[PDB]
Amino acid sequence: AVKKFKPYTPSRRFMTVADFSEITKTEPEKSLVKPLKKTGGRNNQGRITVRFRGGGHKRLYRIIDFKRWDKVGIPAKVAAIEYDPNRSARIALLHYVDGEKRYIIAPDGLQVGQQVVAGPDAPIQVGNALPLRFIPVGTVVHAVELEPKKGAKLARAAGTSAQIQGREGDYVILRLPSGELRKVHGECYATVGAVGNADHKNIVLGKAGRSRWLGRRPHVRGAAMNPVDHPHGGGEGRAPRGRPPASPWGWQTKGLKTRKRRKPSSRFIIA
RNA sequence: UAAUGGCCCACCAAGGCGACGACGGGUAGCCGGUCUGAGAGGAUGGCCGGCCACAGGGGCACUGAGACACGGGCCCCACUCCUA
RNA sequence: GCCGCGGUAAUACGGAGGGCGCGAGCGUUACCCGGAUUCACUGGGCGUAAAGGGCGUGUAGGCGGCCUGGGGCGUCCCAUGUGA
RNA sequence: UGAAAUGCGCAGAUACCGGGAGGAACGCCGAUGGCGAAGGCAGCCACCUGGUCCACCCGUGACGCUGAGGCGCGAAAGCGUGGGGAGCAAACCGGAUUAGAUACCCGGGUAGUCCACGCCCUAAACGAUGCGCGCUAGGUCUCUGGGUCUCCUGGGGGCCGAAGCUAACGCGUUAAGCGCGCCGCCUGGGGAGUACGGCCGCAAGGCUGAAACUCAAAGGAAUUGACGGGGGCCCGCACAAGCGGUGGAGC
RNA sequence: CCUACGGGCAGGCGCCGAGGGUAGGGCCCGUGACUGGGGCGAAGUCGUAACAAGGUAGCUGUACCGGAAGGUGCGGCUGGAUC
RNA sequence: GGUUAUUCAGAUUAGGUAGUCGAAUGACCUACCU
RNA sequence: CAGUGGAGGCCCGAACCGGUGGGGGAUGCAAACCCCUCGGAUGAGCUGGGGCUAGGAGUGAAAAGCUAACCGAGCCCGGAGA
RNA sequence: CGUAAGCCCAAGGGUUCCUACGCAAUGGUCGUCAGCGUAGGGUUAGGCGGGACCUAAGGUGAAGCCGAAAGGCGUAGCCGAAGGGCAGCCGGUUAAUAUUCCGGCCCUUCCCGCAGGUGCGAUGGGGGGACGCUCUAGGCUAGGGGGACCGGAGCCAUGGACGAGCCCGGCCAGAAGCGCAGGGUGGGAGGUAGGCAAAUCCGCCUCCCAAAAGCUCUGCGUGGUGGGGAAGCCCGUACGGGUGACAACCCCCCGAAGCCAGGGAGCCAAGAAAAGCCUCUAAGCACAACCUGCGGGAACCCGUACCGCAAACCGACACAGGUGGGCGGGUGCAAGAGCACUCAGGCGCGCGGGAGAACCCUCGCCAAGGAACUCUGCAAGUUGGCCCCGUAACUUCGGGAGAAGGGGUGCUCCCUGGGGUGAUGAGCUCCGGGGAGCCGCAGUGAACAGGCUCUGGCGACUGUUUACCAAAAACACAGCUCUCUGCGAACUCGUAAGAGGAGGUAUAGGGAGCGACGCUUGCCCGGUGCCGGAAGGUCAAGGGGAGGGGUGCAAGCCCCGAACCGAAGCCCCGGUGAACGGCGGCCGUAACUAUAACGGUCCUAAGGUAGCGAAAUUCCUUGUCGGGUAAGUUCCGACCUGCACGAAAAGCGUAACGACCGGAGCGCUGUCUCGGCGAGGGACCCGGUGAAAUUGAACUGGCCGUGAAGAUGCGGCCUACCCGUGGCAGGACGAAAAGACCCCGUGGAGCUUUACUGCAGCCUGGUGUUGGCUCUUGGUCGCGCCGGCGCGGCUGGGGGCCUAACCCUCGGAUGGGGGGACAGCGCUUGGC
RNA sequence: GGGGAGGUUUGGCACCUCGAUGUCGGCUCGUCGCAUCCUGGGGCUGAAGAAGGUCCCAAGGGUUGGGCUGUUCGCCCAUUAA
Ligand SMILES: [Mg+2]
Ligand SMILES: [Mg+2]
Ligand SMILES: [Mg+2]
Ligand SMILES: [Mg+2]
Ligand SMILES: [Mg+2]
Ligand SMILES: [Mg+2]
Ligand SMILES: [Mg+2]
Ligand SMILES: [Mg+2]
Ligand SMILES: [Mg+2]
Ligand SMILES: [Mg+2]
Ligand SMILES: [Mg+2]
Ligand SMILES: [Mg+2]
Ligand SMILES: [Mg+2]
Ligand SMILES: [Mg+2]
Ligand SMILES: [Mg+2]
Ligand SMILES: [Mg+2]
Ligand SMILES: [Mg+2]
Ligand SMILES: [Mg+2]
Ligand SMILES: [Mg+2]
Ligand SMILES: [Mg+2]
Ligand SMILES: [Mg+2]
Ligand SMILES: [Mg+2]
Ligand SMILES: [Mg+2]
Ligand SMILES: [Mg+2]
Ligand SMILES: [Mg+2]
Ligand SMILES: [Mg+2]
Ligand SMILES: [Mg+2]
Ligand SMILES: [Mg+2]
Ligand SMILES: [Mg+2]
Ligand SMILES: [Mg+2]
Ligand SMILES: [Mg+2]
Ligand SMILES: [Mg+2]
Ligand SMILES: [Mg+2]
Ligand SMILES: [Mg+2]
Ligand SMILES: [Mg+2]
Ligand SMILES: [Mg+2]
Ligand SMILES: [Mg+2]
Ligand SMILES: [Mg+2]
Ligand SMILES: [Mg+2]
Ligand SMILES: [Mg+2]
Ligand SMILES: [Mg+2]
Ligand SMILES: [Mg+2]
Ligand SMILES: [Mg+2]
Ligand SMILES: [Mg+2]
Ligand SMILES: [Mg+2]
Ligand SMILES: [Mg+2]
Ligand SMILES: [Mg+2]
Ligand SMILES: [Mg+2]
Ligand SMILES: [Mg+2]
Ligand SMILES: [Mg+2]
Ligand SMILES: [Mg+2]
Ligand SMILES: [Mg+2]
Ligand SMILES: [Mg+2]
Ligand SMILES: [Mg+2]
Ligand SMILES: [Mg+2]
Ligand SMILES: [Mg+2]
Ligand SMILES: [Mg+2]
Ligand SMILES: [Mg+2]
Ligand SMILES: [Mg+2]
Ligand SMILES: [Mg+2]
Ligand SMILES: [Mg+2]
Ligand SMILES: [Mg+2]
Ligand SMILES: [Mg+2]
Ligand SMILES: [Mg+2]
Ligand SMILES: [Mg+2]
Ligand SMILES: [Mg+2]
Ligand SMILES: [Mg+2]
Ligand SMILES: [Mg+2]
Ligand SMILES: [Mg+2]
Ligand SMILES: [Mg+2]
Ligand SMILES: [Mg+2]
Ligand SMILES: [Mg+2]
Ligand SMILES: [Mg+2]
Ligand SMILES: [Mg+2]
Ligand SMILES: [Mg+2]
Ligand SMILES: [Mg+2]
Ligand SMILES: [Mg+2]
Ligand SMILES: [Mg+2]
Ligand SMILES: [Mg+2]
Ligand SMILES: [Mg+2]
Ligand SMILES: [Mg+2]
Ligand SMILES: [Mg+2]
Ligand SMILES: [Mg+2]
Ligand SMILES: [Mg+2]
Ligand SMILES: [Mg+2]
Ligand SMILES: [Mg+2]
Ligand SMILES: [Mg+2]
Ligand SMILES: [Mg+2]
Ligand SMILES: [Mg+2]
Ligand SMILES: [Mg+2]
Ligand SMILES: [Mg+2]
Ligand SMILES: [Mg+2]
Ligand SMILES: [Mg+2]
Ligand SMILES: [Mg+2]
Ligand SMILES: [Mg+2]
Ligand SMILES: [Mg+2]
Ligand SMILES: [Mg+2]
Ligand SMILES: [Mg+2]
Ligand SMILES: [Mg+2]
Ligand SMILES: [Mg+2]
Ligand SMILES: [Mg+2]
Ligand SMILES: [Mg+2]
Ligand SMILES: [Mg+2]
Ligand SMILES: [Mg+2]
Ligand SMILES: [Mg+2]
Ligand SMILES: [Mg+2]
Ligand SMILES: [Mg+2]
Ligand SMILES: [Mg+2]
Ligand SMILES: [Mg+2]
Ligand SMILES: [Mg+2]
Ligand SMILES: [Mg+2]
Ligand SMILES: [Mg+2]
Ligand SMILES: [Mg+2]
Ligand SMILES: [Mg+2]
Ligand SMILES: [Mg+2]
Ligand SMILES: [Mg+2]
Ligand SMILES: [Mg+2]
Ligand SMILES: [Mg+2]
Ligand SMILES: [Mg+2]
Ligand SMILES: [Mg+2]
Ligand SMILES: [Mg+2]
Ligand SMILES: [Mg+2]
Ligand SMILES: [Mg+2]
Ligand SMILES: [Mg+2]
Ligand SMILES: [Mg+2]
Ligand SMILES: [Mg+2]
Ligand SMILES: [Mg+2]
Ligand SMILES: [Mg+2]
Ligand SMILES: [Mg+2]
Ligand SMILES: [Mg+2]
Ligand SMILES: [Mg+2]
Ligand SMILES: [Mg+2]
Ligand SMILES: [Mg+2]
Ligand SMILES: [Mg+2]
Ligand SMILES: [Mg+2]
Ligand SMILES: [Mg+2]
Ligand SMILES: [Mg+2]
Ligand SMILES: [Mg+2]
Ligand SMILES: [Mg+2]
Ligand SMILES: [Mg+2]
Ligand SMILES: [Mg+2]
Ligand SMILES: [Mg+2]
Ligand SMILES: [Mg+2]
Ligand SMILES: [Mg+2]
Ligand SMILES: [Mg+2]
Ligand SMILES: [Mg+2]
């Protein structure tokens, strides 16, 4: 399920790593209209905008098909399950009958071989994607859109997925990977079933360096800093939050909700 | 060596033993016999006869048909005495 | 020795008379066998008294139907040596 | 609820109709019922699969029975990772009862209960009855199978009882009878399923398992009784219905 | 040093060698502040858990909890009383 | 009239505990056990 | 079980990175050096070159450390003859 | 000196290069010398580097978006290189340059003409370029070793040797072709809806063949031939030129980290772009134009000296510091870029000479003792590599381990096993095993080179840090919990546009705390925070207008103003602890004593659970007891009356780890008893050069007084010839720094909060942007009709639907889709 | 109950020193005082002797090594003429 390690070295005694059995003996990404330069670290003034990112292995961006209604009715064969270094999910290089090739988030169950296709006609079989007004309520589906003709947003994380609770007018109900309850549009496309590689959560970085390869840098407790730096700044011998625990910017992080009441996305939720 | 034997040595082979109790630990001289018990059994080995082992502890060989020898020899340790 | 005895009327303590047993002995203690069929081969048990493994499956081991025949290992019998 | 109180309720509860979500368990059939080695197993559907009984007497020809150790299974609780989470519910909080009430009753409530995988391996894991085989009256109802079929025959499940066993209680062709094979276990109560050592286990723990000391017993079954905040039937100025009186005052 | 001149004894060296020394393990006995339970013994304190429906049926594996017996949860058991 | 605290005097008990129960005074408005 | 295999913020140790202890130096060789010693040394490694982020701002495995040899708020010129 | 202190690149430097003349200053002395002064020379390129090539981060930036101005963001494009692409190797010559001049061999583009060939043609399509880490094969080269073989001028010393003697040297480049070794690459045919319908290309489907060759490319070897070529000897300041051969130019071995290179295998952290190059076609052309050969022609710009681990760069200095890449020989040691010695090459560090005092530094040794030293074994010492034997608690089963403790190690002769090249053999080489023996005090004989154990604390671990007094027990960390966030995400930067988050989507991202792992994490929501709560209470603008006012002759104009409607917030109600936080006092009680399982009682929001406990917490205190020592305020084990532990500012524990901090023991020692001798670099003396802080001026003694209370300087007494040199640190309240402590100033600044007052931000009502239709409750005026029905403007509120503003988005759309009069933004209201 | 001496303690005062008079303990080197710990001389003694006690005189010299703590001090070990 996951590769363990004999403790021939500390850290290595706890560190597990995925088994890329599901990866169809295919190191190389499809160099074709498929990879792409990628880089970053912080924002477009020179300034850091997101703490503690940076460093960590070089990456190639694999272009992914998230609209998947360009090729309506056009089938394609699942040529490969590939490793994507920049999502939790695994990917499927699938060849279209067209001779067109793209990538898709490999869902659980997908076998290299499987035919697959998008469109309203399509079979409610694992892999195929089609509008929502069209999937039988109760179906667990993934890689969903949100507003129609707009690309997939919901449920793309590894082994995640949402179910259809019901329909209701031009909209359908969904239960997001978060448990949220939402009316999405009927005409929203969604590939069927749930996401590949659900085994993900159980890896265990195990050592410090491994987090670093991930490009995540060390992150330092508020407690550790000084008043200039951060509201937990009293430092004065390991010390108690002196107040309701806050962000480096001093907004409460202890439980305070942040979501803009008067958001219009509002009257389409329930969870 | 009186003589067989890994009894001892060199060389080679990878074996030998074990729940049918090896290996270890504890305990003990064994026997004819003796005590007990209806008997099967149990307990036992004083005296007597046989066998074994030992001679303050340990090691050794010499002489010899025979001993590694209680009242023989060499050595070490412990112990007693003599001393110039 | 055990069951127990002695808290006013003691055949259970101590003394007495008397009696019983055995006598150059009589008691105590120690240890062995017996009683103990209480390790049970002789000769024991397990529903509730102590005691059936929580249940399978199987290794070794133990045990094994009817008839003919060969050997004769156990088994049996005879003689003979031995059992000082 | 014994009666209550905490609790919920005008911020609109309880009762009622409609709509939706989610988890768990499977009413009636149901049983003195069946199946499985045991633990154990219950809506319906299919799929995959183990055992078992009967008929025909066709095949192999003693290939068997047991079974230390080993290996597997092993209720509930409990553990690890991850889900799930309606009702219930140790812990916990509150109400009440009480001398007190860390309980019984009530209101609330978390692990847990459910699933996947992994571990734990215990039990009144009980028929307190090891498995196999042959022997030794019958009566009764019941499940299941075969046969011209007011009944014979085989396999289970019960109650009553031949002989016989048995300390009694009870057993009795479902033996605790009569016999053989093999395994497991017992050897006075307490100390103690403890300690040490070993081996398992994430832990909680489990397996193996003493002794010092100490007691005159510990016990099984049955018999008389007496007692029960056990039951049934019945009696008495016992209570009730009823009239006086103490308790108060003085003596 | 002896010789019948071939050799012998003395002596030297080496092997092994009692034991002694050093170091590290194993088994066992004694002992140790203190601590754990256990057994017996005045007529001590606190409750009343079990025996009768023992006054909440009992026991039991486990789990939590509690001055203490013990209580509760989950399952199991009659070795449970009463129509 | 009520609440509470305490106390001994009784009361219920075979008896004790406790309690209930009663009274006084100050303040105030059925349970266990021998 | 043996073989093969060749993992690892694994071990010893130079380069390289670093600064643990002591001595020396203290108008120094040196405005942080020297010697002996010591830490890391396939990694959260070291490093050349090209770039971006700055003053209540940046950067910070967090010392209020660093930001051109003194940073609890850089340097310069100015308000200023506060 | 020789993994440099030698040699070649790059950066920085900028004439420091070479000559000639010269020494005032520069040079830490000297100077005839110089890196110094004067002057003259000196740097040569199609092929090396860079530009007339590509793209990276980034920058710039037509469009476009945003901002008071300045300016910000930004597409295409353009700029940007130690990365991609691209054609030169050996040797000679100068005082000074040289893949640059010359010699030799060998190449590249451009244009022209031509031959042959082909649908030609790009900025567009496609291929390719095009990629990580670790380990690694085959073959080869650089490089290196041996040679009795090839060449060579020479040498016989000092006892021996005329020899398989000694010493020197036995290479370098090279087109075609050939060979060896490797990389790259499927071929053919049909169909095609895709690569923004341009395709014979690429992709995808179908079948047939060859499964490898062939073709293509690269490395090496060879290869016509060109080159070079030592020791030693004569001339020689200089520095070379001759000799010096007509040189020889050959075998064998070791051998890369380099080459073949886009090789192979494994792994997870999943590993640039763009042009060149190839191919496809479009427009356009097919007398063009592409392609291949040959001939003739053309080929610019900039760098090129010298220094370059330093006396030429950065450090004010000819500064013991700092500075990226390549080469970096031999021998020995297990290996190596380590160590010792040494080639080549380069240096003796730009003050010397003496002396042989103290004292200081670096170093050596020491009788007996062996931690008694001391805050501390600080420091030194011991140990030290490899080989074999052996190795404990505990453990997370890997560890602990180099545990511990041991033995071996040199040289000679003999027997012998295996691997490599060759061929299987010899020779060479790599790694061994067995016996016999020799010498010394000692055999990793020198240099490199661990002392060890036991037991506490904290922290899991490797890591990080206060550049320049702190390296830690602090930070970090894998891991745990809480919390926010549904995507135009939350959050952060920005006035905005926008960006980061993320080309991510709840297995994700932001915040917070805790900090491997094991076992666990108790009670208290009264206060605070947060979350929930369509009721109520208060509450601003605004709406409303009874009622009152000013003025006017009036119509009016103007102002004040009650009820009543009006958000968020606060109040109120409930939840909430891995949210801020909190978690008691007193009296009585048991067989003697003591104690208190029991009770009582006051207070509370609730009174601290496990576990730990004189502790990184314990005041009293060196608590008390045990251990250890002759002796122990430390340490370890216990008890617990915890001044003042305690459960994620986590509680207890835990193998391993540690330049952490504590205690103990063994080894060893000059740490000490207790010092002594010796070495060198200073100190001292002579010659050259020649500072500094400091300094009221000085002709500057002791004592006892005294004085502003600590006198060379007043008094009194005592002592004392003048001047120096080497020494010591008691005084000159010695130097240094306008005391850091302390106070003061209505001085400053950083930090905090439930100080005050703002501001950003965020919440919020009205309103502008702002529209349509419809249902129903309230108002409003006219009418029909006995306070109510029907109607329209006005409506105010609430529900629903619409779409066209506004927002998002869609193969660019005068459009489709989604949201939608909301949101966003403007003004304004009150809040936090 | 009373009177003093000293100037080693704890203090009070705030006089020099805040354009600086470095703090506890140790080491090293001491030197002074005597109010004497030893040794020398003596008086009394409830001094037999021996050993002591108390006071007087006397600085000449001497006045150990370790354990524990930063300690001074103190406790402790082994001594000493002390
Ligand atoms: Mg952190
Ligand atoms: Mg702050
Ligand atoms: Mg704080
Ligand atoms: Mg801090
Ligand atoms: Mg603190
Ligand atoms: Mg033998
Ligand atoms: Mg052999
Ligand atoms: Mg014996
Ligand atoms: Mg004996
Ligand atoms: Mg017998
Ligand atoms: Mg015997
Ligand atoms: Mg015997
Ligand atoms: Mg005898
Ligand atoms: Mg005898
Ligand atoms: Mg003897
Ligand atoms: Mg004797
Ligand atoms: Mg002897
Ligand atoms: Mg004899
Ligand atoms: Mg003898
Ligand atoms: Mg004798
Ligand atoms: Mg004599
Ligand atoms: Mg004599
Ligand atoms: Mg009598
Ligand atoms: Mg009697
Ligand atoms: Mg009598
Ligand atoms: Mg008697
Ligand atoms: Mg017997
Ligand atoms: Mg017997
Ligand atoms: Mg028997
Ligand atoms: Mg029996
Ligand atoms: Mg059974
Ligand atoms: Mg026969
Ligand atoms: Mg369970
Ligand atoms: Mg639990
Ligand atoms: Mg049962
Ligand atoms: Mg019966
Ligand atoms: Mg009968
Ligand atoms: Mg029987
Ligand atoms: Mg047991
Ligand atoms: Mg048990
Ligand atoms: Mg044991
Ligand atoms: Mg656990
Ligand atoms: Mg009365
Ligand atoms: Mg003779
Ligand atoms: Mg021998
Ligand atoms: Mg009871
Ligand atoms: Mg009760
Ligand atoms: Mg109950
Ligand atoms: Mg009960
Ligand atoms: Mg009962
Ligand atoms: Mg059961
Ligand atoms: Mg019963
Ligand atoms: Mg019962
Ligand atoms: Mg009274
Ligand atoms: Mg390795
Ligand atoms: Mg490492
Ligand atoms: Mg480096
Ligand atoms: Mg100095
Ligand atoms: Mg500033
Ligand atoms: Mg300046
Ligand atoms: Mg001014
Ligand atoms: Mg080096
Ligand atoms: Mg010049
Ligand atoms: Mg030159
Ligand atoms: Mg000059
Ligand atoms: Mg000069
Ligand atoms: Mg100089
Ligand atoms: Mg001259
Ligand atoms: Mg001259
Ligand atoms: Mg000259
Ligand atoms: Mg030009
Ligand atoms: Mg734009
Ligand atoms: Mg460009
Ligand atoms: Mg070039
Ligand atoms: Mg022509
Ligand atoms: Mg073409
Ligand atoms: Mg092109
Ligand atoms: Mg590259
Ligand atoms: Mg020749
Ligand atoms: Mg000669
Ligand atoms: Mg030579
Ligand atoms: Mg020579
Ligand atoms: Mg070949
Ligand atoms: Mg096409
Ligand atoms: Mg076409
Ligand atoms: Mg073609
Ligand atoms: Mg063509
Ligand atoms: Mg070759
Ligand atoms: Mg060649
Ligand atoms: Mg040639
Ligand atoms: Mg040049
Ligand atoms: Mg340098
Ligand atoms: Mg300079
Ligand atoms: Mg110099
Ligand atoms: Mg080299
Ligand atoms: Mg010099
Ligand atoms: Mg010495
Ligand atoms: Mg010595
Ligand atoms: Mg001493
Ligand atoms: Mg100390
Ligand atoms: Mg040291
Ligand atoms: Mg060790
Ligand atoms: Mg040698
Ligand atoms: Mg070492
Ligand atoms: Mg570290
Ligand atoms: Mg520092
Ligand atoms: Mg963005
Ligand atoms: Mg954005
Ligand atoms: Mg992005
Ligand atoms: Mg992501
Ligand atoms: Mg746990
Ligand atoms: Mg807590
Ligand atoms: Mg209401
Ligand atoms: Mg009016
Ligand atoms: Mg008027
Ligand atoms: Mg109104
Ligand atoms: Mg409001
Ligand atoms: Mg809690
Ligand atoms: Mg509080
Ligand atoms: Mg009371
Ligand atoms: Mg203390
Ligand atoms: Mg203390
Ligand atoms: Mg003490
Ligand atoms: Mg206390
Ligand atoms: Mg907390
Ligand atoms: Mg806390
Ligand atoms: Mg470290
Ligand atoms: Mg001042
Ligand atoms: Mg003032
Ligand atoms: Mg002020
Ligand atoms: Mg209306
Ligand atoms: Mg409205
Ligand atoms: Mg709508
Ligand atoms: Mg629309
Ligand atoms: Mg719409
Ligand atoms: Mg238009
Ligand atoms: Mg809509
Ligand atoms: Mg001054
Ligand atoms: Mg001064
Ligand atoms: Mg001071
Ligand atoms: Mg006297
Ligand atoms: Mg005297
Ligand atoms: Mg006097
Ligand atoms: Mg005197
Ligand atoms: Mg004196
Ligand atoms: Mg003290």
Curated annotation (Swiss-Prot):
Biased composition range(s): Basic residues: 256-271
Cellular component per GO, a single term: large ribosomal subunit
Basic and acidic residues: compositionally biased ranges: 229-239
InterPro entries the UniProt entry points to: NA-bd_OB-fold, Rib_uL2_dom2, Ribosomal_uL2, Ribosomal_uL2_bac/org-type, Ribosomal_uL2_C, Ribosomal_uL2_CS, Ribosomal_uL2_dom3, Ribosomal_uL2_RNA-bd_dom
Function statement: One of the primary rRNA binding proteins. Required for association of the 30S and 50S subunits to form the 70S ribosome, for tRNA binding and peptide bond formation. It has been suggested to have peptidyltransferase activity; this is somewhat controversial. Makes several contacts with the 16S rRNA in the 70S ribosome.
Family, per entry: Belongs to the universal ribosomal protein uL2 family.
Protein name, per record: Large ribosomal subunit protein uL2
The organism's taxonomic lineage, starting at the top: Bacteria, Thermotogati, Deinococcota, Deinococci, Thermales
